[PDB]
């Protein structure tokens, strides 16, 4: 603990994204929004707009 900031430990995590000519298996939460009924809304279910 008695070191300078340059010598103190730092935990590093590197996120790399492997994008091949293969199906994506990781996607974003896609901004899960609440359901609204009995009101004219612009809906999108699983990409179906």
């Amino acid at each position, epitope marked *: *603990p*008695t*070191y*300078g900031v340059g*010598y103190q430990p730092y935990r590093v995590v590197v996120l790399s994204f492997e994008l091949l000519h293969a199906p994506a298996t990781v996607c974003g939460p896609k901004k899960s929004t609440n359901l609204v009924k009995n009101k004219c809304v612009n809906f999108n279910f699983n990409g179906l707009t």
Partner: antibody, heavy 122, light 108 residues
């Protein structure tokens, strides 16, 4: 800065030797310095006993670790040393010093205290 | 084990000359070293840290050859009050904070 030692000057064999070092030139709660104890028998070389950090923990000698403990008190701004089962080989002058360990192996005692002579005899 | 060996045990030189104390570590790791001076009846005084850095208040005549396993403290111009016992101190992994056997510098 200054360091002053305090404690009984006589310890009977096979008993705990207690010492307390009080500093007044700075702060022991600083996160840049250790506070250590270094002893030397009369006419002999220096022997680092142990160094304590402000939080609680400390590290000691690989020979005296069984019968040694260190404590700290930020409120009173002083750190203490206990040496259990003192034999006749502990008859020595004990200084308390200020340690700076910046990189890995850089560990020097910046300012020493005058030290007190504890002679262990019956 | 990283054992510390200083040399020589006693050094006989007169004021005006230059003294060369050697502090070699075992055949082992290499990094920094600290040199301390201790006069009779006084607590040891820090002379040099990080294998050559004059402490706060050390004259320019003190220097350190901070190099491999072997280290060297050099005193350019021996002054009358520069004759004392000199200890080199390392901080290895195990044992931590090893001290040298000490070099006694006296007036020939």
């Amino acid at each position: 800065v200054q360091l002053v030692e305090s404690g009984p000057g006589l310890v009977k064999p096979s008993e705990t030797l207690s010492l307390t070092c009080t500093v007044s030139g700075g702060s022991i709660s600083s996160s840049s310095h250790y506070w250590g104890w270094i002893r030397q028998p009369p006419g002999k070389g220096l022997e680092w006993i142990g160094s304590i950090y402000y939080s609680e923990s400390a590290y000691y000698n690989p020979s005296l670790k069984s019968r040694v403990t260190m404590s700290i008190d930020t409120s009173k701004n002083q750190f203490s040393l206990k040496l259990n089962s003192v034999t006749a080989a502990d008859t020595a002058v004990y200084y308390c010093a200020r340690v700076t360990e910046p990189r890995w192996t850089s560990c020097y005692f910046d300012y020493w205290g005058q030290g007190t002579l504890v002679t262990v005899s019956s | 084990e990283i054992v510390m060996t200083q040399s020589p045990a006693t050094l006989s030189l007169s004021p005006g000359e230059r003294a060369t104390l050697s502090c070699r570590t075992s055949q082992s790791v290499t990094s920094y070293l600290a040199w301390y001076q201790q006069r009779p009846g006084q607590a040891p005084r820090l002379l040099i840290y990080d294998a050559s850095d004059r402490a706060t208040g050390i004259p320019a005549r003190f220097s350190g050859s901070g190099s491999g396993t072997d280290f060297t403290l050099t005193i350019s111009n021996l002054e009358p009050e520069d004759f004392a016992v000199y200890y080199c101190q390392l901080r290895s992994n195990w044992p931590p904070i090893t001290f040298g056997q000490g070099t006694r510098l006296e007036t020939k």
